[PDB]
Assembly symmetry: C2
Homo-oligomer: 255 residues x 2
């Protein structure tokens, strides 16, 4: 109520995930190392709400999931829970596991799970077909939203997909493995759309499934949620989110 963001210094959790965030590893310092759709949103928020900020990456370079053996979180989620950060500023997918531990901002983008495949010859219509064949290998990135949704899906065949697939380290590794061929990568629509635009030998496996949002992550009881929510809604209503997606997402296709 009384608290606002004027004069505050926010620590923002993030990682590279194009086109939401690009992180330069040399030739820059501090916030200047960061660019992308989410960075543009943060810059505007900082101008309008009067805060300064820095970005903090999790050492494990994970987005975050709950380990059912240890009951501990990792990734950006863990950094937020541990008060290393105040908000997670990225394409953070909405899922129930995360919601049990953190809050979400007003959302900025609808997204679904999308599976893609590289390979000549017989192909697949739906991801569960992977379980009854051995032509294609497949995988999801560990400690990231798609893995969590497949593991919590009430049809435990989706947990089989996760358990019997390759555990991929991060998006670069997943895309490298996909490009190696005879592989199905199961991830998120907007991420794949942007990053695989030139991969003319990569095709869809069925339709997108599951419905969720990208939002920012906020700790429970954050004094800043109301303001962030209001301002993100205004961004959406004013067309800013759409303008930034057009700015940053890849256009055309050589294909």
């Amino acid at each position: 109520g009384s608290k606002n963001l004027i004069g505050r210094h926010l620590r923002l959790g993030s990682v590279e995930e194009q086109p939401f965030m690009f992180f330069a590893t040399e030739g820059c310092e501090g916030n200047d190392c960061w660019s992308g759709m989410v960075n543009d949103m943060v810059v505007k928020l900082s101008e309008d709400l009067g805060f300064t900020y820095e970005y903090i990456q999790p050492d494990d370079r994970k987005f975050g999931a709950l380990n059912k053996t240890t009951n501990e979180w990792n990734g950006m989620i863990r950094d937020l829970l541990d008060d290393k950060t105040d908000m997670i500023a990225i394409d953070l997918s909405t899922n129930s596991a995360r919601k049990s531990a953190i809050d979400y901002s007003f959302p900025f983008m609808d997204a679904g799970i999308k599976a893609v495949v590289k390979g000549e010859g017989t192909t697949l219509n739906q991801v569960l077909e992977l379980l009854d064949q051995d032509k294609y290998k497949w995988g999801v990135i560990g400690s990231r939203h798609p893995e969590t949704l497949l593991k919590t899906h009430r049809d435990s065949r989706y947990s089989r997909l996760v358990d019997e697939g390759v555990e991929l380290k991060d998006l670069n590794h997943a895309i490298e493995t996909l490009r190696g061929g005879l592989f199905v990568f199961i991830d998120e629509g907007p991420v794949l759309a942007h990053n695989l635009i030139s991969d003319c030998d990569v095709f869809s496996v069925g339709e997108e499934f599951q419905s969720f949002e990208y939002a920012f992550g906020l700790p429970k009881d954050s004094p800043y949620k109301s303001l962030i929510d209001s301002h993100l809604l205004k961004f959406r209503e004013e067309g800013f989110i759409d303008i930034l997606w057009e700015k940053w997402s890849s256009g055309n296709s050589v294909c």
Copy 2:
């Protein structure tokens, strides 16, 4: 929420809510996608509930002359209700007064007209002609978005168009011909499914959500948000849209 009683603001808006005006008692007068959501929430969280309609039968908007709200929004601000359970569109004006739950459906503004082969390509072209009339429903979200749009030609559309009482009046006027009705995609999709001579004018514009409305500092927001997100994740929202929307 276990043991609690929630007063829920709502009105008829098919296929989200159907209200029977006779032949029923209490909660059983209501049905539809939103009712099915409320029933499941009630079972899972353990609250009882009733529905309360605003006397003015409006969704609600802020009158910039009086700086007062009407409709379901006003009933919530007046503490006549605890939550608004309907397809409540997200807009900044409402956000200045109330909170929203986690959303359950994307929606856009859509314009429609009767008669094949309309010559209109975009709604602002209406300002430069007088073959067609047009309008929006008063004290409802599309009116608010057009009035608050950066491009004040959208305010012109509202000010120079017909103020429609409600969805029935609007569809009636649409079906009467030579009239462009500007409203919300999902509502129009459902309610005009059988109108095979009604057509879109331009593309949908504006991006918003349907959510429930909550008073600021509600003690119930966290739980409602969590359970609505779980409904989306489990596929329940999509199953209900398939159940209720035509067809």
